[PDB]
Amino acid sequence: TMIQPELALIPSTMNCMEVETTNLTSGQYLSRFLANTTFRGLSGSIRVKGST
Amino acid sequence: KRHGSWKIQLNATSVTHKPNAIQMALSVCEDLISSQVYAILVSHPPTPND
Fold first, then answer.
1. Glycans attached where (chain A)?
2. Per-residue CA distances from B26 to A12, A23, B30, B35 (Å)
3. Contact predicate B22/A19, CB 8 Å
4. Is B20 on the interface with A (CB under 8 A)?
5. Neighbours of A17 (CB within 10 A)
C-alpha cells in the first residue's frame, strides 16, 4: 500500500472464469512483495527464498 | 515423409494465440493436454513485445 495501494487493495480479477489479462495484476504485484519480505516472526525469523 | 520409421506417426494441430492468458491456458489445457501431444513450438504473439 506504500507502493501501489490501488493495485494492492483492489483485486484484479472479479470473475472465477473471466480474468482480464492485466499487465500488473493485483496478485502479480503482491507476488513481488511476497518475494521481498524479511522480518522477525513469533517462532523466529521469516524471509523469502527463491521468491517462492 | 522423410523419416523411415514405420511405428511413428506425426500430426500437427493449429493452436492460435488466444488474446488472453486465461483463454490461452484454457485452450491449451482443453486441446493440447487432451491430445497427449508431444513437444510444442513457440511463436511470437501479435504484440511486438509481450
1. 23, 36
2. 19, 19, 6, 14
3. yes
4. yes
5. 7
Chain B interface, mutation test: which of A15, A21, A24, most B Cβ atoms within 10 Å? Answer: A21
Experimental technique used? Answer: cryo-EM
Classified as helix, coil or strand, A8 is helix
Between A and B, how many residue pairs show a Cβ–Cβ distance under 8 A?
A: 10
Yes or no: say if A35 and A51 are a contact pair by the CB < 8 Å rule.
Answer: yes
B49 close contact with A: CB closer than 8 A: no
Which residues, 6+ apart, have CB-to-CB distance to B40 below 8 Å?
A: B15, B32
B37: left (phi over 0), alpha (psi -120 to 50) or beta: beta
